[PDB]
Enzyme design. Sequence first.
Site, PDB file in Angstrom:
ATOM      1  CG  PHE E  22      -2.317   0.592   0.904  1.00  0.00           C
ATOM      2  CD1 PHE E  22      -2.431   1.960   0.707  1.00  0.00           C
ATOM      3  CD2 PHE E  22      -3.448  -0.187   0.811  1.00  0.00           C
ATOM      4  CE1 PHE E  22      -3.635   2.529   0.400  1.00  0.00           C
ATOM      5  CE2 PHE E  22      -4.673   0.377   0.552  1.00  0.00           C
ATOM      6  CZ  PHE E  22      -4.767   1.726   0.347  1.00  0.00           C
ATOM      7  CG  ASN E  23      -0.075   4.964   0.328  1.00  0.00           C
ATOM      8  OD1 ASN E  23      -0.707   5.377  -0.609  1.00  0.00           O
ATOM      9  ND2 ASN E  23      -0.669   4.879   1.491  1.00  0.00           N
ATOM     10  CG  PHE E  57      -4.557  -4.435  10.171  1.00  0.00           C
ATOM     11  CD1 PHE E  57      -4.723  -5.786  10.493  1.00  0.00           C
ATOM     12  CD2 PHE E  57      -5.168  -3.516  11.004  1.00  0.00           C
ATOM     13  CE1 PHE E  57      -5.409  -6.202  11.628  1.00  0.00           C
ATOM     14  CE2 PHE E  57      -5.917  -3.921  12.113  1.00  0.00           C
ATOM     15  CZ  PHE E  57      -6.018  -5.260  12.446  1.00  0.00           C
ATOM     16  CB  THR E  80       3.444   5.466   3.036  1.00  0.00           C
ATOM     17  OG1 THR E  80       4.863   5.551   3.037  1.00  0.00           O
ATOM     18  CG2 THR E  80       2.894   6.853   2.761  1.00  0.00           C
ATOM     19  CB  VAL E  81      -0.923   5.238   7.050  1.00  0.00           C
ATOM     20  CG1 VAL E  81      -2.399   5.454   7.310  1.00  0.00           C
ATOM     21  CG2 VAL E  81      -0.523   3.810   7.359  1.00  0.00           C
ATOM     22  CB  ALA E  85     -13.082  10.489   2.952  1.00  0.00           C
ATOM     23  CB  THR E  86     -13.586   7.550   6.726  1.00  0.00           C
ATOM     24  OG1 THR E  86     -12.668   6.502   6.501  1.00  0.00           O
ATOM     25  CG2 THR E  86     -14.551   7.667   5.515  1.00  0.00           C
ATOM     26  CG  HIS E  88      -9.898   2.352   7.318  1.00  0.00           C
ATOM     27  ND1 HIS E  88     -10.497   1.340   8.037  1.00  0.00           N
ATOM     28  CD2 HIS E  88      -9.021   1.748   6.473  1.00  0.00           C
ATOM     29  CE1 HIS E  88     -10.017   0.173   7.647  1.00  0.00           C
ATOM     30  NE2 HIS E  88      -9.131   0.400   6.696  1.00  0.00           N
ATOM     31  CG  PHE E 113       7.203   2.966  14.383  1.00  0.00           C
ATOM     32  CD1 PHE E 113       6.159   2.087  14.113  1.00  0.00           C
ATOM     33  CD2 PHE E 113       6.971   4.337  14.315  1.00  0.00           C
ATOM     34  CE1 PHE E 113       4.919   2.568  13.737  1.00  0.00           C
ATOM     35  CE2 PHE E 113       5.733   4.824  13.930  1.00  0.00           C
ATOM     36  CZ  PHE E 113       4.710   3.932  13.645  1.00  0.00           C
TER      37      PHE E 113
HETATM   38  O1  LIG Z   1      -0.048   0.605   4.508  1.00  0.00           O
HETATM   39  C1  LIG Z   1      -1.187   1.108   4.389  1.00  0.00           C
HETATM   40  N1  LIG Z   1      -2.265   0.241   4.459  1.00  0.00           N
HETATM   41  C2  LIG Z   1      -3.576   0.556   4.140  1.00  0.00           C
HETATM   42  N2  LIG Z   1      -4.409  -0.494   3.811  1.00  0.00           N
HETATM   43  C3  LIG Z   1      -5.230  -0.944   5.009  1.00  0.00           C
HETATM   44  C4  LIG Z   1      -4.633  -2.229   5.743  1.00  0.00           C
HETATM   45  O2  LIG Z   1      -3.291  -1.923   6.075  1.00  0.00           O
HETATM   46  C5  LIG Z   1      -4.655  -3.738   5.209  1.00  0.00           C
HETATM   47  O3  LIG Z   1      -3.786  -3.879   4.104  1.00  0.00           O
HETATM   48  C6  LIG Z   1      -6.036  -4.637   5.023  1.00  0.00           C
HETATM   49  O4  LIG Z   1      -6.922  -3.586   5.465  1.00  0.00           O
HETATM   50  C7  LIG Z   1      -6.572  -5.891   5.883  1.00  0.00           C
HETATM   51  O5  LIG Z   1      -5.439  -6.333   6.624  1.00  0.00           O
HETATM   52  C8  LIG Z   1      -3.900   1.937   4.060  1.00  0.00           C
HETATM   53  N3  LIG Z   1      -5.200   2.451   3.741  1.00  0.00           N
HETATM   54  O6  LIG Z   1      -6.161   1.717   3.876  1.00  0.00           O
HETATM   55  O7  LIG Z   1      -5.330   3.578   3.371  1.00  0.00           O
HETATM   56  C9  LIG Z   1      -2.748   2.922   4.036  1.00  0.00           C
HETATM   57  O8  LIG Z   1      -2.797   4.155   3.890  1.00  0.00           O
HETATM   58  N4  LIG Z   1      -1.477   2.411   4.189  1.00  0.00           N
HETATM   59  O1  LIG Z   2      12.101  10.933  20.953  1.00  0.00           O
HETATM   60  C1  LIG Z   2      11.506  11.279  19.909  1.00  0.00           C
HETATM   61  N1  LIG Z   2      11.487  10.366  18.867  1.00  0.00           N
HETATM   62  C2  LIG Z   2      11.078  10.631  17.570  1.00  0.00           C
HETATM   63  N2  LIG Z   2      11.553   9.794  16.582  1.00  0.00           N
HETATM   64  C3  LIG Z   2      10.546   8.704  16.252  1.00  0.00           C
HETATM   65  C4  LIG Z   2      10.861   7.310  16.964  1.00  0.00           C
HETATM   66  O2  LIG Z   2      10.955   7.574  18.352  1.00  0.00           O
HETATM   67  C5  LIG Z   2      12.034   6.286  16.598  1.00  0.00           C
HETATM   68  O3  LIG Z   2      13.288   6.830  16.954  1.00  0.00           O
HETATM   69  C6  LIG Z   2      12.114   5.435  15.175  1.00  0.00           C
HETATM   70  O4  LIG Z   2      10.902   6.001  14.632  1.00  0.00           O
HETATM   71  C7  LIG Z   2      11.887   3.864  14.901  1.00  0.00           C
HETATM   72  O5  LIG Z   2      11.968   3.256  16.186  1.00  0.00           O
HETATM   73  C8  LIG Z   2      10.313  11.811  17.370  1.00  0.00           C
HETATM   74  N3  LIG Z   2       9.807  12.247  16.101  1.00  0.00           N
HETATM   75  O6  LIG Z   2       9.713  11.431  15.204  1.00  0.00           O
HETATM   76  O7  LIG Z   2       9.468  13.381  15.943  1.00  0.00           O
HETATM   77  C9  LIG Z   2      10.264  12.811  18.509  1.00  0.00           C
HETATM   78  O8  LIG Z   2       9.729  13.932  18.521  1.00  0.00           O
HETATM   79  N4  LIG Z   2      10.887  12.457  19.686  1.00  0.00           N
END
Ligand SMILES: O=c1[nH]c(NC[C@H](O)[C@H](O)[C@H](O)CO)c([N+](=O)[O-])c(=O)[nH]1
Ligand SMILES: O=c1[nH]c(NC[C@H](O)[C@H](O)[C@H](O)CO)c([N+](=O)[O-])c(=O)[nH]1
Lengths: 154, 154, 154, 154, 154, 154, 154
Positions: E22-23, E57, E80-81, E85-86, E88, E113
């Site tokens: 996705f994206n 997900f 990327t998410v 509109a909603t 979700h 993350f």
């Molecule tokens: O990684 C993403 N997953 C998305 N798909 C939803 C979900 O992550 C699953 O693939 C599926 O819904 C059931 O597991 C997103 N949107 O729906 O928009 C999105 O923006 N980004």
């Molecule tokens: O301690 C912080 N971590 C941040 N980094 C994100 C995260 O904590 C991790 O270091 C990494 O995203 C994957 O574990 C922040 N921002 O993203 O802005 C923040 O403001 N402060």
Amino acid sequence: MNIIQGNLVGTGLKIGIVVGRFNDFITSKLLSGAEDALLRHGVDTNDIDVAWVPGAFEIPFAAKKMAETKKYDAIITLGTVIRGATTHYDYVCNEAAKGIAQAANTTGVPVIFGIVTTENIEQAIERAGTKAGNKGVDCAVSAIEMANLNRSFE
Amino acid sequence: MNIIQGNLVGTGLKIGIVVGRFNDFITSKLLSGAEDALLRHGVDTNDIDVAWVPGAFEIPFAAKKMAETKKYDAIITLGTVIRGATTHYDYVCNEAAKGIAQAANTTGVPVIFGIVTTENIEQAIERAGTKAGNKGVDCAVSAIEMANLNRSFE
Amino acid sequence: MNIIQGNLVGTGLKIGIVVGRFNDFITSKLLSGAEDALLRHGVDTNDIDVAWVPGAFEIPFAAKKMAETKKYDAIITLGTVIRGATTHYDYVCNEAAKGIAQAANTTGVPVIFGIVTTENIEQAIERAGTKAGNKGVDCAVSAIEMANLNRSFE
Amino acid sequence: MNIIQGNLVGTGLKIGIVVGRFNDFITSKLLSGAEDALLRHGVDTNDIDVAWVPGAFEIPFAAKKMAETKKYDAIITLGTVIRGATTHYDYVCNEAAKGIAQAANTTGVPVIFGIVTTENIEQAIERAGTKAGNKGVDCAVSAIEMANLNRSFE
Amino acid sequence: MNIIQGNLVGTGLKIGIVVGRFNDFITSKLLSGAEDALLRHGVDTNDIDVAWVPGAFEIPFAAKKMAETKKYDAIITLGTVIRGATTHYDYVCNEAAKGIAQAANTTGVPVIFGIVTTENIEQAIERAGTKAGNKGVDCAVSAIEMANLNRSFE
Amino acid sequence: MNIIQGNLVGTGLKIGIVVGRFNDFITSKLLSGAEDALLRHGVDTNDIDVAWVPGAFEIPFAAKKMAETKKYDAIITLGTVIRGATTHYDYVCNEAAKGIAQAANTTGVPVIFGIVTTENIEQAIERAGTKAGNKGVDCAVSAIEMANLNRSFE
Amino acid sequence: MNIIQGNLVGTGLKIGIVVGRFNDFITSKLLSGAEDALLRHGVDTNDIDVAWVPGAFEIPFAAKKMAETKKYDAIITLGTVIRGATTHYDYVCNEAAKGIAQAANTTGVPVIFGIVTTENIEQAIERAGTKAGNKGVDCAVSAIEMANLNRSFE
Ligand SMILES: O=c1[nH]c(NC[C@H](O)[C@H](O)[C@H](O)CO)c([N+](=O)[O-])c(=O)[nH]1
Ligand SMILES: O=c1[nH]c(NC[C@H](O)[C@H](O)[C@H](O)CO)c([N+](=O)[O-])c(=O)[nH]1
Ligand SMILES: O=c1[nH]c(NC[C@H](O)[C@H](O)[C@H](O)CO)c([N+](=O)[O-])c(=O)[nH]1
Ligand SMILES: O=c1[nH]c(NC[C@H](O)[C@H](O)[C@H](O)CO)c([N+](=O)[O-])c(=O)[nH]1
Ligand SMILES: O=c1[nH]c(NC[C@H](O)[C@H](O)[C@H](O)CO)c([N+](=O)[O-])c(=O)[nH]1
Ligand SMILES: O=c1[nH]c(NC[C@H](O)[C@H](O)[C@H](O)CO)c([N+](=O)[O-])c(=O)[nH]1
Ligand SMILES: O=c1[nH]c(NC[C@H](O)[C@H](O)[C@H](O)CO)c([N+](=O)[O-])c(=O)[nH]1
């Protein structure tokens, strides 16, 4: 870099679906979409089981129970929660995602998230076979993929 | 596709209900609705137990405890949380859903979510036997359904 | 329908309270309210223990620890979180409710939620012995009730 | 009523701190504050260990790991999350509090929450040794208190 | 005060990445960034495995499964998410962070993350190799650091 | 560069406090804060003397007199002056600081300044154990520090 | 197509830095960032030399002089120029970039450009270890890269 990927051939998979009765105006169309996409990817209609529940609060309960049988390669969840006057919506949406997530996690069986959550009815119609396609379709596709990938996971 | 469904006959089920004292203006009417719907679906009034608690924060505690006895086919939870001046509402609502969810999950016993959560009093009146029907009624119905379906789950 | 209820006689109960130092302008008055209501319901002042902690983030830690001794029939938690400039408030409130909830759940010992969470100081004064009564009082009452009901739970 | 309280003498405590690298403009000043307050309460600088992590998402991981060694009487967590354009902030804040909370809970070792979470830079400066004092200082104080109280807990 | 720190040399690490389809307009660029940064820090391209999933997900499911093999020193998650509109969006974001967090926690294996969550497309472009750098890059860096630090953790 | 610093251990100090009766709604809470912080830093309650005066105009008189006995290591002053209709406020505030300052100066005995001076009542509540902490607490802390540093001064 | 690239391992490099005293509120934090990133990429602190100058007008002079010794694999320049009332800013910025550019060019030694040039103080704080990361960090990274690539250049 070694790529690990599930492909899209559904031949020989066994799939459980849990569908909410609430907003079944929409949710039956999601089930139709899912049915179709599975069969045309090669799943046998004899290999699909469908559990109906009252609403989205119940989906995680039926999902974990179906998953824990070990009969299914992946589980599909289908629901629609449309915003009303109060915050009730949110508690439902929230609990629903969280439990679905937990059910895959405890079980090791892929559980796809197909709960359409919206602000109004036309929005729900957009994601049930109109403008934005059909969430039940995309869900069926993701379920096949996850069932195939998880075979790389044992 | 094989459909699995619970039907609506309550004959021979045993049901526990947990009801919050807070906003009992509303919550007693939810209990009335639930009582009625159960009996008219065939549950014996001798087969219903009702535990009163201080408020919604306590519902999950009494729910898990009743569930874990193994006496009941399904548990009904009933409460009303109406928004005030501050955010306290939310913490309550949130914890309440989460625990109710957990109680079914750890126990394998269906726990229905009947907490009416609103912005004002007229809203709570709408869902307690007025314009939007009676949440205690719909809850009783979902409990029978879940008790019947879960027999497919052993 | 069989009603299960805890009554209000505190005679012979043993109660632990955890109180936050943060906003103790308010929280000492909550403790006063709680003290009073317990004694006048018949709890012996010799049967009440009080653990002070830095703030609401720590309440769940002290609560679970006191609960797990098995000395107490119910635990009372008391705190005040007043909104400031940023979102920090929320994280605190949230974690606090969640842990308090968990502490009852893992322990089987009733843990009452007495954290007053508000937008400003006059609001906190309303719930500490003014216009809206005293949350420490209502908490003491709910603790007696839960201690009595949980005896029906073994 | 029996009061249980930790006093403020740090003499002989052993303290672990986890500090986020992200926004270390602020977070190093929080660490300075914490260092100072500990030493002047009598902790030996030889008895303080400091683990640096990428950001707040990682704090719970390092915190639980340090806690589980059993070397420390209390753990201090230090971080700054300043709001940006999107919602990412929140997910971080949320996960961070939740894990910190979990780490104390599973381990029985006090874990203090010192993540300054704000809307802008001047706000973070207010809580890092300016107008609103220094959160690292207050944290060090709460850690000593919790280390002392938890000795009443075994 | 004793400082514990992971340094930045990737030589000899083994890294798993989970990337959402996705994206993937954005997510493939995040994967490119991550690939590059790892190799130029000394990870062998033969030592990187990449699992594609349907969307965010599913990331926690594949992440925990890869982590639990014990083959990898750290796991990188990429997604990327973008808001629609909603609501979700939120449920997805929320569940995704929570599971990623859980996966490190249960496994003892660092899980970074890397889910870019935004309000619109130009925002996602800012964090995928434009104005705000490349999140896949920063992620690769944090993964090396965490793999090195966790060796101090056994 | 040689650093000279007082540390925070109150063990064996002897402390005098002068507290104003005016606005004693607030000033008794400041005295409570101060009491607590001193004891938990190790001052013996037997080693604290407290002189009540009519209001802040009198604080410098009692302060110099207590200081000049030579019984105390540091003196704490506590008062609240809230703005009214006229300028009287200012004359009081002004004279009060000036005399407190003079009392340390002539005597060589540390005299801490704890007069909360505000525009309204909610402000005074903020600095007496609410949002902005408790000035009596911070004062007790500064008094210990000054008593310790002044030993470097003979 | 043949790709030529410097990788990121700093092991065995020797690095000179020139830092401006002007706005050293900011510029010392840039130097900290740079120090850290170099060491954690494997540069020996014994292999880093740091020349302080009055301000950015002087950076090119010290840079060319350090470069021309032939002791260093790459030079890092660090400065902050914040807009004031008049155009002076610009002349400084301009001359500074131009000379830094010239110094690499005449010398064949990589000279990294780390002059943060802004409209106000909060902007400079954004690029010195806050919201926009730390320019001293990114600079250290680019210096390692350029030192490695230039070995392909003899
Ligand atoms: O990684 C993403 N997953 C998305 N798909 C939803 C979900 O992550 C699953 O693939 C599926 O819904 C059931 O597991 C997103 N949107 O729906 O928009 C999105 O923006 N980004
Ligand atoms: O301690 C912080 N971590 C941040 N980094 C994100 C995260 O904590 C991790 O270091 C990494 O995203 C994957 O574990 C922040 N921002 O993203 O802005 C923040 O403001 N402060
Ligand atoms: O699937 C849904 N369930 C809903 N019903 C609530 C809930 O899911 C349960 O069926 C019942 O509340 C107790 O479990 C919804 N609303 O309430 O609006 C909704 O929109 N969608
Ligand atoms: O059931 C409810 N409980 C409420 N009481 C709070 C709580 O549920 C507990 O009874 C007690 O707080 C400690 O457990 C509510 N309010 O506070 O407003 C409410 O609206 N509804
Ligand atoms: O009890 C409270 N604790 C607070 N302190 C924060 C926290 O509870 C801890 O004491 C400490 O943060 C680390 O555990 C609060 N504020 O920060 O504002 C508050 O309003 N109320
Ligand atoms: O301590 C205070 N003293 C006050 N009383 C005035 C004064 O301090 C003396 O008690 C008396 O005026 C003659 O010495 C104040 N007001 O008048 O408002 C006040 O706000 N606070
Ligand atoms: O590094 C800086 N140098 C500055 N000083 C000017 C200059 O760099 C020289 O130090 C001196 O002017 C003669 O060489 C700056 N200002 O004047 O504002 C500035 O913002 N930043």
